[PDB]
Write a protein that binds this ligand. Structure first.
Ligand SMILES: Cc1cc2nc3c(=O)[nH]c(=O)nc-3n(C[C@H](O)[C@H](O)[C@H](O)COP(=O)(O)O)c2cc1C
Ligand code: SF4
Ligand code: SF4
Ligand code: SF4
Ligand code: FES
Ligand code: FES
Ligand SMILES: [Ca+2]
Lengths: 905, 146, 156
């Protein structure tokens, strides 16, 4: 299409509306109610331009550019005097009731309303009357509510309801008393409620966790990092100030997590700021804890390692690729053990084999929203991979999108799309041990044990393709529902099969692979998604090694006298008693970690590693994409006695001191090149980010904004002399403003979005080639593996039905978004949000034991009698007992595990 | 429906039509046609944008036509007495009759049925009787508050 | 604590029978609850939400949007005096002054015994007989300030 803006010709896409087309060209139109992800509704009337019928037209007409299609040969004007005066009048009308709140408002300096008030040039107030006020609600521990600052742009309700699928937020009231919130005080129920702080263009919804230790946006030090709280790998911008992590903002990745995080990623960063973290290396001498510097800790550790006869290394899926590789190099490939259980490692390896050998394309998180039918097998995605659940909701609304497109309704006119697609939606079939949070939009929900879910998947694969193995013992109504699933999936142009390793069953993953193969054989454009557990689970699976049980037997039999545990608490992957016995038997335990774990009581040496905020590295997400996270701040800048290094730096210097009796604090690119040379399956991680020599016209990339303040006074209480600026030899970023963050810079790693006149999160529009699309010059991250030409075979190992045996109790996993991730549990703000641990029981089983709802029962596993109060779960299958995974004492290795001595306390 | 004029198989023609009465909850914006559609769906009466028109997708995404009471009252007269009778009611571009009337401190505040083209002074003087005693006429609104 | 009665639930479901979407019976469900109990309490929103299968935020937004769905406790009788333009021409201000003198309240709140509550209302569609006033089910026209005590004494 061709448009003429202010007499200048432009070539745009005709399917877009005028506002997004003009913002993609760099033109500045003020706007409030439109969002690139939510569509156009034409409420705020801020985006007004003047449209003319032809070139020889002088009068024109004011139109909303967000609601005007960018048709071919469209003549408009933004800088028309009438349009400018109307946009100024809209800003003024918004400003009549706005509170005098900017100094004491957390959105100041990050406010879209401030930016558009300045952009319209409106700075004189001629309104002399009273301003309306509102009471505020309590929205829980995460979101702070300030209703006075609202401009009634309806972004919150549209996002939270039409996009996120939440139910408890809404718009109440009338003419100019419109209220946006919950009907009563209470916590926002959605797992994606945290994106309201970026969706809201004003200070109504604010980050309460940030509002505790508040600082303005110009005062933050930012870095482009990857969220470490599950395997999705959403791009984040951690921002720090005064040596502590202050905020997690969304970082735009048009291929992964474009505008939206989940609440675990956004608010579960509080473990970084804990005061019990290791900040110096500590050596045990009898009962004494001697604090060492880097050099003497490395010398003593390498000497004791040299006197040892066999050193084993226990990695972790929390650690980066470089740190796991450095441990593998230090202890040797044959002595390296992945720090996960044998069943967990088997499920992880099977998921990786399906992803990179099954011949079926695995979509990115953004690409999930374009699929026509979704089958989720055994994976509670809302609690384990939440952004996948959000993308599944978008893919479900794709049917309403297609129905509206059949009636020649444009894709940005969201109200008409929702009107045409009333309740018609794409087929969604979820299977779990109980009800999921996707049940409100699911076409069918199957509450069954993991064997029965696997048998359902194998039956679906057999009915789609008769070459697949059959299932014997299917009930006729279950067969009818299976047939419903089969005709829904076979009629889909782009079916999607989602599973993962959190189900605790190998057969569920095998059944999902069988369904995907059966759909691939029919010619469908099938995609497969596997949800892992931790941030670098796929990286640890690609690296390979032994299981944690093998390392425990190596420690117990005395074949290994030295163990180096990297970023692993060892209690989430094995029993605590056996781990404690093996670590007490081992004469040398060296724990390289950044969190105070329980295994440092018996550890001979504790190396104060860096977390993601204080380190660089690479992580492989659930779809096999290598992503580089960068260090946010130097921990030794404010506390000069802090020796907190990267884990790969610790292990590489330990290897160098073990070999040549000399420390070597290496560079990140050297470890990256070592990974690429030694492990060819991880050769793609070289291209995740450019090396430390990367420059933009000769200068580095800035971590902090141009107006970063207090540089001669933040450390003046320690010493009036300004310290040396921390040098960054590992990466292309600098710990200063002396760098580049231009939106037109040829790069893909963007620490934060800021353009002049756009201080809000809306500056990501300036950082994209087209708004709502990809990052300009490509999104960061590279897929490690391509789709194989030939797939796997059908898995003939069809499990039997779940048999409830007396005495035994099958543990059904119950994951929680706030409580299943270890570091997220360590965050103090999650302690109020996380629920009290309830053991879930069937009504029939609770009647059999005679226990009611709320009474405490005690059960023993691995000789550990623990007590929990009972919650009645009707959707659970009899013979199963539900356990909340990741919680206090309930390790996630209990999925699929049997249970003994379930008795009332 | 007792006489078979509504419901299934109306007048033996096979046409099915069911008529309901939805009583409102007292808001002025509900008279707007798209907002009327929204309030019929049990939502807040925010009006919708056009295009798409309610004829393309109105109530519950279905083709829907919203018409006033008076228009549906002139419809049977057209369909019974004929079209050429309806065009010959008045010698004006607006065919048919219309319920007109003056209200507010007049002698005869009421409502009458007049053809289009009737001057406003005829309604005020010949029908409403003019203004009340000792009142000087200042202004008038032709079609209500809007 | 709010329990719906059997008659209320039956009437609500019968109203759901009239539409192809159960959301369309929210206004009539709120009106049924208000007719049975005088107003719509806080638990009634959740009860109608569970009956209709729509979120409670939607029912709350509908109840707070419409003026005749009361979300605060009112008296046993509701005076609704028309404040619109034609009744202003015919002198609704004297009627409002007489009502404020008799009830000894301001508009919008309730008497100390909950016997009347006073409300300015929209145009009642009776402008040729203005001024007009709506008591609970009865419309009154041709109002005079002297007729307020003799009109309000028949509502106990
Ligand atoms: C604010 C507003 C209020 C309206 N109220 C009414 C109304 O009460 N009754 C009515 O018939 N039309 C009302 N309309 C006009 C309708 O939008 C619509 O034109 C009409 O109901 C049907 O059109 P018709 O005259 O061809 O039958 C209103 C329009 C607006 C903008
Ligand atoms: S929301 Fe924006 S304009 Fe309003 S008080 Fe806060 S910073 Fe100022
Ligand atoms: S609370 Fe924020 S997002 Fe919601 S309408 Fe008001 S300004 Fe917009
Ligand atoms: S979905 Fe996972 S990776 Fe993304 S923000 Fe949430 S916890 Fe982080
Ligand atoms: S952005 Fe177009 S009217 Fe709000
Ligand atoms: S103006 Fe009062 S009834 Fe119409
Ligand atoms: Ca570094």
């Amino acid at each position: 299409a061709t448009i003429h803006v202010d007499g200048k010709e432009y070539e745009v896409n005709g399917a877009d509306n005028l506002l997004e087309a003009c913002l993609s060209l760099g033109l500045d139109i003020p706007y409030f109610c439109w969002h690139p992800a939510l569509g156009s509704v034409g409420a705020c009337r801020q985006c007004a331009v003047k449209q003319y019928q032809n070139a020889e037209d002088t009068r024109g007409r004011l139109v909303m550019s967000c609601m005007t299609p960018a048709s071919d040969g469209t003549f408009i004007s933004i800088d028309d005097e009438e349009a400018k005066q109307f946009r100024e009048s809209v800003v003024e009308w918004l400003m009549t009731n706005h509170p005098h709140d900017c100094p004491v408002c957390e959105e100041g300096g990050n406010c879209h309303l401030q930016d558009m008030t300045v952009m319209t040039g409106h700075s004189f107030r001629r309104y002399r009357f009273t301003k309306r006020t509102h009471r505020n609600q309590d929205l829980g521990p995460f979101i702070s509510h300030e209703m006075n600052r609202c401009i009634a742009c309806y972004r919150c309700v549209r996002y939270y309801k039409d996009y996120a699928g939440g139910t408890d937020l809404g718009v109440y009231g009338a003419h100019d008393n419109v209220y946006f919130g919950r009907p009563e005080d209470g916590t926002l129920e959605s797992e994606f409620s945290g994106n309201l702080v970026e969706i809201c263009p004003t200070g109504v919804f604010t980050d309460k966790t940030h509002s505790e230790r508040y600082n303005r946006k110009w005062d933050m030090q930012f870095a482009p990092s990857i969220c470490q709280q599950c395997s999705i790998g959403c791009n984040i911008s951690p921002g720090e100030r005064y040596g502590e992590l202050r905020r997690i903002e969304n970082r735009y990745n048009g291929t992964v997590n474009h505008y939206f995080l989940c609440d675990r990623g956004r608010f579960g960063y509080g473990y970084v700021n804990l005061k019990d973290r290791p900040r110096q290396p500590v050596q045990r001498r009898g009962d004494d804890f001697i604090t060492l510097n880097a050099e003497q800790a490395m010398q003593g550790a390498a000497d004791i390692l040299r006197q040892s006869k066999k050193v084993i290394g226990i990695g972790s899926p929390r650690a980066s690729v470089e740190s796991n590789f450095a441990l593998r190099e230090l202890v040797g490939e044959e002595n390296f053990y992945t720090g996960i259980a044998h069943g967990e490692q088997e499920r992880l390896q099977l998921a990786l084999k399906v992803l990179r050998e099954g011949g079926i394309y695995t979509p990115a998180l953004r690409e999930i929203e374009s699929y026509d039918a979704v089958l989720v097998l055994g994976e509670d995605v809302t609690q384990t991979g939440a952004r996948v659940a959000l993308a599944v909701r978008q893919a479900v609304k794709g049917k309403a999108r297609e129905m509206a497109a059949a009636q020649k309704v444009a894709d940005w006119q969201i109200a008409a799309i929702l009107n045409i697609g009333q309740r018609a939606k794409h087929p969604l079939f979820v299977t779990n041990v109980d009800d999921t949070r996707l049940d409100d939009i699911a076409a069918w929900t199957y509450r069954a044990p993991v064997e029965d879910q696997a048998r359902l998947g194998f039956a679906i694969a057999h009915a789609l393709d008769n070459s697949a193995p059959a299932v014997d013992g299917i009930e006729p109504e279950l067969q009818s529902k299976i047939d419903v699933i089969v005709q829904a999936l076979a009629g889909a142009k782009k079916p999607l099969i989602i599973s993962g390793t959190n189900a605790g069953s190998l057969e569920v993953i095998q059944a999902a692979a069988n369904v995907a193969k059966a759909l691939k054989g029919r010619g469908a454009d099938v995609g497969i998604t596997m949800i892992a557990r931790s941030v670098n689970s796929m990286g640890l699976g690609i690296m390979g090694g032994g299981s944690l049980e093998e390392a425990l037997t190596e420690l117990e039999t005395g074949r290994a006298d030295a163990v180096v545990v990297l970023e692993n608490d060892l209690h989430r992957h094995a029993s605590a008693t056996r781990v404690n016995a093996a670590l007490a038997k081992a004469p040398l335990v060296m724990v390289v970690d950044h969190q105070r774990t329980a295994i440092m009581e018996n550890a001979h040496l504790v190396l104060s590693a860096a977390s993601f905020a204080e380190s660089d590295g690479t992580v492989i997400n659930n779809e096999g994409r290598a992503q580089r996270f960068f260090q946010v701040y130097d921990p030794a800048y404010y506390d000069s006695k802090t020796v907190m290094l990267e884990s790969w730096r610790w292990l590489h210097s330990l290897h160098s001191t073990l070999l040549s009796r000399e420390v070597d604090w290496t560079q990140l690119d050297h470890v990256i090149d070592a990974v690429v040379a030694k492990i060819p399956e991880l050769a793609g991680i070289k291209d995740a980010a450019p090396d430390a020599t990367f420059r933009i016209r000769g200068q580095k990339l800035a971590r902090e904004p141009h107006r970063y303040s207090g540089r001669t006074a933040m450390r003046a209480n320690i010493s009036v002399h300004e310290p040396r600026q921390p040098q960054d030899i590992d990466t292309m970023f600098t710990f200063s403003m002396e760098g580049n963050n231009q939106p037109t810079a040829h790069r893909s790693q963007v620490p934060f979005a800021w353009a002049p006149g756009w201080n809000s999160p809306q500056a990501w529009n300036k950082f994209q080639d087209e708004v709502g699309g990809k990052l300009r010059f490509g999104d960061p991250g590279v897929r490690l593996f391509e789709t194989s030409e030939n797939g796997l075979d059908y898995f003939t190992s069809v499990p039997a039905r779940f048999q409830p045996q007396d005495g035994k109790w099958r543990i059904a996993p119950y994951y929680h978004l706030f409580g299943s991730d270890e570091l997220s549990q360590r965050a103090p703000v999650f302690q109020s949000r996380m629920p009290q641990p309830y053991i879930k029981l069937n009504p029939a089983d609770a009647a059999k034991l005679g226990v009611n709802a709320g009474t405490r029962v005690s059960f023993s596993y691995d000789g550990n009698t623990v007590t929990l109060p009972v919650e009645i779960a009707e959707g659970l299958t009899a013979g199963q007992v539900g356990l909340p995974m990741g919680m206090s004492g309930i390790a996630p290795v209990l999925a699929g595990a049997h249970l003994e001595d379930l008795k009332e306390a | 429906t007792e006489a078979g004029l509504l419901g299934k198989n109306i007048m033996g023609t096979g046409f099915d039509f069911e008529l309901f009465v939805h009583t409102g909850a007292g808001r002025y914006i509900c008279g707007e046609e798209t907002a009327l559609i929204n309030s019929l769906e049990g939502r807040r009466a925010n009006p919708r944008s056009k295009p798409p028109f309610p004829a393309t997708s109105g109530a519950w995404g279905k083709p829907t036509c919203v018409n006033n009471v008076e228009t549906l009252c002139n419809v049977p007269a057209i369909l019974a007495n004929g079209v050429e009778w309806y065009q010959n009611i008045s010698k004006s571009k607006d065919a048919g009759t219309k319920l007109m009337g003056f209200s507010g401190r007049v002698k005869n505040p009421g409502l009458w049925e007049l053809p289009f083209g009737t001057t406003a002074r005829e309604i005020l003087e010949d029908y409403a009787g003019g203004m009340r005693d000792g009142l000087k006429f200042k202004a008038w609104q032709p079609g209500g508050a809007g | 604590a709010f329990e719906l009665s059997a008659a209320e639930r039956e009437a609500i479901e019968h109203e759901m029978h009239h539409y192809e979407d159960p959301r369309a019976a929210s206004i009539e469900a709120l009106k049924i609850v208000q007719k049975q109990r005088g107003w719509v309490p806080d638990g009634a929103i959740h009860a109608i939400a569970d009956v209709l299968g729509i979120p409670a935020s939607d029912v709350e937004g509908v109840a707070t949007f419409y003026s005749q769905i009361f979300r605060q406790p009112v008296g046993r009788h509701v005076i609704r005096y028309c404040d619109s333009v034609v009744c202003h021409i015919n002198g609704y201000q004297g009627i409002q002054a007489a009502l404020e003198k008799k009830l000894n309240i301001k508009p919008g709140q309730t008497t100390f015994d909950g016997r009347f509550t006073l409300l300015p209302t929209c145009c009642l569609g009776n402008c040729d007989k203005g001024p007009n006033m709506m008591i609970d089910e009865d419309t009154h026209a041709h109002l005079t300030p002297e007729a307020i005590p003799e009109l309000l004494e028949r509502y106990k």
